[PDB]
Ligand SMILES: CC(=O)N[C@H]1[C@H](Oc2ccccc2-c2cc(C(=O)O)cc([N+](=O)[O-])c2)O[C@H](CO)[C@H](O)[C@@H]1O
C-alpha cells in the first residue's frame with residue numbers, strides 16, 4: 001500500500017506535510033473548506049484488489065495547538081465526523097493500482113489572522129491494514145499546512 005502528495009514520492013508509512021490553498025479572506029460566519037482529495041492519493045501495490053487495503057482515520061486526529069479553540073467537521077469516505085476525532089472512522093477499501101484521491105475534506109470554523117501562511121492547521125492520523133497474512137499494518141500522519149494566510 002502506498003500514497004503520494006501532489007504526485008510526489010511514494011509513502012508507505014510515517015509523517016508527511018500536505019500544503020493546501022485556502023480562501024484568503026473569509027467573513028464572520030464562514031467556514032474554511034480544505035479538500036484533501038486534491039492532494040493525497042493512495043493505491044494498492046499489487047492491483048486487481050489482490051490483498052486489499054483497509055484504511056481508516058484515527059481517534060486523536062486534531063487541530064494544531066494554536067487552533068485548539070476552532071471547531072471542525074471531517075468528511076471521510078461518505079461520512080462526516082466532528083473534529084477532533086473522538087472515534088476512529090469507517091474503513092475505505094483500496095485495491096486498484098491506479099491512485100485514488102482520498103475522499104477526505106476538513107471544514108473549519110475559526111473561533112485578524114485566521115490562519116498564518118506556513119502554520120500547521122491539523123494533524124490527521126491514518127491506519128492501514130491489508131487482507132493477507134498479518135496485513136502488514138502501517139501508520140501515517142498527514143500534517144496539513146497552509147500555503148497562504150487567511151484573514152477575517
Ligand atoms: C510488507 C507490505 O507492506 N506489504 C503490502 C504490499 O506492499 C507492497 C507490495 C508490492 C510492492 C511494494 C509494496 C510496498 C510499498 C511501499 C511503498 O511504496 O511505500 C511500502 C511497503 N512497506 O511498507 O513495506 C510495501 O502491498 C499490498 C497491497 O497494497 C499490501 O498493502 C501488503 O500488506
Ligand SMILES: CC(=O)N[C@H]1[C@H](Oc2ccccc2-c2cc(C(=O)O)cc([N+](=O)[O-])c2)O[C@H](CO)[C@H](O)[C@@H]1O
Pocket residue numbers: 056057058059060088125126127137138139140141
Ligand atoms: C489506536 C489509537 O487510537 N491511538 C494509538 C495510536 O495509533 C495510531 C496513531 C497514528 C496512526 C495510526 C494509529 C493506529 C490506528 C489503529 C486503528 O485505527 O485501528 C491501530 C493501531 N495499532 O494498534 O497499531 C494504530 O498509536 C499510538 C502509539 O504510537 C498510541 O498507541 C495511541 O493509543
